[PDB]
C-alpha cells in the first residue's frame, strides 16, 4: 500500500528522450513501409507488362510468368538463408522473442534481408502479407535508433523495439489502432510485466501512419462499401460461424507447423535445395496469378469481390481450398512474408460462404452474405494467432462497418473459444516456442 | 529462464471454463442493471419535466418546483451514500481501481443499492453527472457478488470477475463494447505489476451486457452526429495545437476538482447533516438551471449533437463552457454519487467546437467544418485529465462513428496527454485513489 500510493502519484511519466525517439522511429518505419510497399507494387507491375509483350501463346508466357516469380522467389530465399536466417517467414515470432530478451535484433542484417527479401517473394506474387515483414522491419528500425543514439535501459530497449513493430503494422494496413492493440495484446512479453510505454508506441504509430497517409491517401486497401445492419434476432448465426473458425483455427495451425517440417526435408537445411525449391513455389505463384489469380497473391484482391457475394458457391470453395494449399506452401516454406493478410483473405472467403448458406436458409432475416464475410474476415486471425481484440479492430479500421461490431466481436470471440477447447495455441507463440526449443537442444 | 518461457508460451490462452461462464453471468446482470438504471434515471427527468408543466403559468411557483425536486432528489442521494456507503460517493472508478489493487473492499451488499438508488437520485434530478462512474462501480460489485455467491476462488477469478464487471459496466453505459475492454486494459488495471486477469473473460462479459443494453435500446443512439467531413493532411497540425490546449487545460482542471473537493468538505465539515443539505442545494440549483439554461445542467449528452452540428454561437459556446465547468466541479467535487466521465465528453466537445469555429474563419483555404474539431475535442479532456487516451479515442469512435476522423482524433488526444504529462498533471483516477488511500493511513 504505502508504496503503491507512491507509485500512483508517479504514474505516466515517460522520459522525453524515449518520447522524442519514438517519433523518429515511427517516421522511419513509416517511410520504410511506404518504400517496401511501392517496391512490391513495382515488381508485380513488370511481371504484368512482360506478359503483355509476350501475350502468346499460352506457353510462351505461362513460362515467363513462372520464371519471373521463380527468379524473384530465389533472390528472396537466398537473401534470407545467406545473411539473415531469422528474417524467414513472418517476423512476429522473432520480435516477440526480442521483447522477451530471448532473441537478438541484428538490424544491420535483417533490414536489407527482409526488405529486399520480401520485395522478391511479395513482388513475385506469393501468398504472403506485408505485415510480418514490416512489423519485423519495424522493430529493427527501432533497434537501429537505440544503437545509433546509445540509448540504454530496459524500458528504452523494450519501448523503441515495441513502437517500431506497432508503427510497422500501422503503416502496413493503415490501421493505427490495430497497430497499438497488437503490441498490448500479443507482441508484448506475455507472462510478466514489461516496461513498454504506451504513450510512446502511439506517437510512433501516428508518425508512421501519417507517412503512409502522405503516400497512399485517396485509396483504401480494402473497399467494401457500407453494408446492411444486423438484427438482434440474427446474432446466433455469428456465434455458429465463430465456432467453425474455432475448430479450424487450431487445425490450420497444425498444418502450418507440420508443413514447415515436411518442407524442411525437401532441402534438409541446405541453402541450395531451399532456394531452388522456393524458386519453384515462387514460380507456381506467378503462374496461378495468371490462370486463377484468386488462388495466388496476397489476396486483398478478392476481399471486395467476395464481400459483394460475386463468387458463386463453387468458386468460393475452390478459392478456399486452393488458398489453404498455397498459403501453406508460401508460409511453411520459410520464405520471408507474413501469413496475416492471407488469413484475412481466408476468413473473408470462409465468411461469405457461410453467409450464402444463411441467406437461403432464412430469407426472413433479409441477410446479406457480405456481413458474414466481415465477421469472418478477422475470425481466422482470432482462432489461429489468437489475438482477437487486434483482429476485430483490424477489420474495423479496414472495412468501416462499425454497425457490425457485435457480430464481429461475437464471431471472433466464439472462434477464440473453440480454438481453446480444441487445444490450439497462439500460432505466433507456437512458432517462438519451436525456435527457442530447437536451440537449447 | 528460456526453458520456463517455452514452458509458459506453449500453455498460453487457457482460461478455466468456470471463469468464462461466470463472466457471462456477470455480463448479463451488469447489462440488465445498467438498463434498469438507465430507465429509472429517464423516468425521473420526465416526471420532473412534467411537474413544471402542471405549473407552467406561475413563474415563481415554477422556478420553485424545479429547484425543490432536484433538491429533494440530490439530498436523498447524498444521504444514502453518507449513511450506508461512503465508497459509493463520486465516480466509482477510483474505488474499483482500488479493488483491483486489492486495496479497497468491494462491499457489494452495500454499494449496489446505495450507488444505484443514489445515482438514480442525483442523475435523475438533473445534476451534472454521468452513468459511467456509477455503472462501472455497480459493474464491479455485481462481479464480486457473483464471486461470493459461487465462491469461485483464487486471484484469476477475483480480478477477472471484478474486471469484467467494470468493463461490462462501461460498455452498457455508453453502448460501447470496445471502449469498455480498452478501459480495463489501459486504465482500470493495476498499473505497476503483472495481473492474472483473463482478457477473453472480460470479452464475454462485455458482449453479454452490450447485448442486454441492445435489447432495450436498439434504435436511437446515444449520440448522433451524422457523417461529418474528412480532414485533409494539411489540416492535422490544427488538431495538435488543439491537443496542446486540452493538454495544458487538462491538469488545471484536475487541480480544481481536487481543490473544490476540499473547499466543499469545509461547508459541511464532514457532518452528515450539512452534507445532505449542501447536496440538496447544489442539486436544487441544477434542476433550476436545467430549465432556465439547460445547456448548463444535465449530463451533457444533449448538447453534443447541437454543438457538433454548429448550431451554437461563439458567444453561447464560451458561456456554456464556463457554466458547465462550474456545474461539473460543483457536482462531482461535492462527492454526490455520479461520474465525471460523461460531463468530460461535453466540455471536450464544446471546446473543440469553439476551437473549430475560430479555426474555420482563420482558414477558408482548408474548407474546415468546426464539427470535426468538436469530435477531436470530445475525447481530449478524457485524455488530459483521465489519461486514458486509447479509451477516449475508442469511446468517441464508438459513439460518433466518424472513423475517417481517426488521425485528427489520435493526434488531438495524444497531444493532450503529452502537455498534461509534461505540465505536471496526474491521472485524475489515480490522484483521487491516492488521496482516499493516503487519508486512510494519515488518519492514524
UniProtKB/Swiss-Prot annotation, chain B:
Induction summary: By acid-shock conditions.
Impact noted for substituting residue 187 to K/R: Decreased proton and chloride transport
Sequence ranges on the Periplasmic membrane side: 54-60, 217-236, 294-313, 361-370
Site note Mediates proton transfer from the protein to the inner aqueous phase, residues: 187
Gene Ontology biological process terms in this record: cellular stress response to acidic pH; chloride transmembrane transport; proton transmembrane transport
Binding-site residues, chloride: 91, 340-341, 429
Result for mutant: residue 187 to D/H: No effect on proton and chloride transport
InterPro entries, alphabetized: Cl-channel_ClcA (IPR023861), Cl-channel_core (IPR014743), ClC (IPR001807)
Gene Ontology cellular component terms for the protein in this record: plasma membrane
Effect of residue 187 to A/G/Q/S/T: Abolishes proton transport, and reduces chloride transport
Motif Selectivity filter part_2 positions after renumbering to this chain: 130-134
Keyword Metal-binding: no
GO-annotated molecular function: chloride:proton antiporter activity; identical protein binding; voltage-gated chloride channel activity
Transmembrane parts of this sequence: 17-53, 61-84, 108-125, 132-150, 199-216, 237-265, 272-293, 314-333, 339-360, 406-422
Membrane topology: Multi-pass membrane protein
Assembly mode: Homodimer.
PANTHER family named in the record: CHLORIDE CHANNEL PROTEIN
Family: Belongs to the chloride channel (TC 2.A.49) family. ClcA subfamily.
Free-text function comment from the UniProt entry: Proton-coupled chloride transporter. Functions as antiport system and exchanges two chloride ions for 1 proton. Probably acts as an electrical shunt for an outwardly-directed proton pump that is linked to amino acid decarboxylation, as part of the extreme acid resistance (XAR) response.
Protein's name according to its UniProt entry: H(+)/Cl(-) exchange transporter ClcA
Biological source species: Escherichia coli (strain K12)
Name of the gene this protein is made from: clcA
Amino acid at each position: 500500500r504505502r508504496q503503491l500510493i507512491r507509485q500512483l502519484l508517479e504514474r505516466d511519466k515517460t522520459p522525453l528522450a524515449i518520447l522524442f525517439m519514438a517519433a523518429v522511429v515511427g517516421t522511419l518505419v513509416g517511410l520504410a513501409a511506404v518504400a517496401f510497399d511501392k517496391g512490391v507494387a513495382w515488381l508485380q507491375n513488370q511481371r504484368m507488362g512482360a506478359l503483355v509483350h509476350t501475350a502468346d501463346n499460352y506457353p510462351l508466357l505461362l513460362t515467363v510468368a513462372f520464371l519471373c516469380s521463380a527468379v524473384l522467389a530465389m533472390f528472396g530465399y537466398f537473401l534470407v538463408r545467406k545473411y539473415a536466417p531469422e528474417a524467414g517467414g513472418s517476423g512476429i515470432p522473432e520480435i516477440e522473442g526480442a521483447l522477451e530478451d530471448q532473441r537478438p535484433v541484428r538490424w544491420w542484417r535483417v533490414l536489407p534481408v527482409k526488405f529486399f527479401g520480401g520485395l522478391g517473394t511479395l513482388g513475385g506474387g506469393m501468398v504472403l502479407g506485408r505485415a510480418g515483414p514490416t512489423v519485423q522491419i519495424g522493430g529493427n528500425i527501432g533497434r537501429m535508433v537505440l544503437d545509433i543514439f546509445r540509448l540504454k535501459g530496459d524500458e528504452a530497449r523494450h519501448t523503441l523495439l515495441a513502437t517500431g513493430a506497432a508503427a510497422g503494422l500501422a503503416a502496413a494496413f493503415n490501421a493505427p489502432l490495430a497497430g497499438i492493440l497488437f503490441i498490448i495484446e500479443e507482441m508484448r512479453p506475455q507472462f510478466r510485466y514489461t516496461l513498454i510505454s504506451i504513450k510512446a508506441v502511439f506517437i510512433g504509430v501516428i508518425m508512421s501512419t501519417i507517412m503512409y497517409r502522405i503516400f497512399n491517401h485517396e485509396v483504401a486497401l480494402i473497399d467494401v462499401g457500407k453494408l446492411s445492419d444486423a438484427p438482434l434476432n440474427t446474432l446466433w448465426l455469428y456465434l455458429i460461424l465463430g465456432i467453425i473458425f474455432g475448430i479450424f483455427g487450431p487445425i490450420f495451425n497444425k498444418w502450418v507447423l507440420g508443413m514447415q517440417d515436411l518442407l524442411h526435408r525437401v532441402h534438409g537445411g541446405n541453402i541450395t535445395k531451399w532456394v531452388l525449391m522456393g524458386g519453384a513455389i515462387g514460380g507456381l505463384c506467378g503462374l496461378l496469378g495468371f490462370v486463377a489469380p484468386a488462388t495466388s497473391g496476397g489476396g486483398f484482391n478478392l476481399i471486395p469481390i467476395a464481400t459483394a457475394g460475386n463468387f458463386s458457391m463453387g468458386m468460393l470453395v475452390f478459392i478456399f481450398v486452393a488458398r489453404v494449399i498455397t498459403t501453406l506452401l508460401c508460409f511453411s516454406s520459410g520464405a520471408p512474408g507474413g501469413i496475416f493478410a492471407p488469413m484475412l483473405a481466408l476468413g473473408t472467403v470462409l465468411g461469405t460462404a457461410f453467409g450464402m448458406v444463411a441467406v437461403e436458409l432464412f430469407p426472413q432475416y433479409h441477410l446479406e452474405a457480405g456481413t458474414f464475410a466481415i465477421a469472418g474476415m478477422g475470425a481466422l486471425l482470432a482462432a489461429s494467432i489468437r489475438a482477437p481484440l487486434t483482429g476485430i479492430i483490424l477489420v474495423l479500421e479496414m472495412t468501416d462497418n462499425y454497425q457490425l461490431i457485435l457480430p464481429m466481436i461475437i464471431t471472433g470471440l466464439g472462434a477464440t473459444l473453440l480454438a481453446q477447447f480444441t487445444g490450439g495455441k497462439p500460432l505466433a507463440s507456437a512458432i517462438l516456442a519451436r525456435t527457442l526449443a530447437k536451440q537449447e537442444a
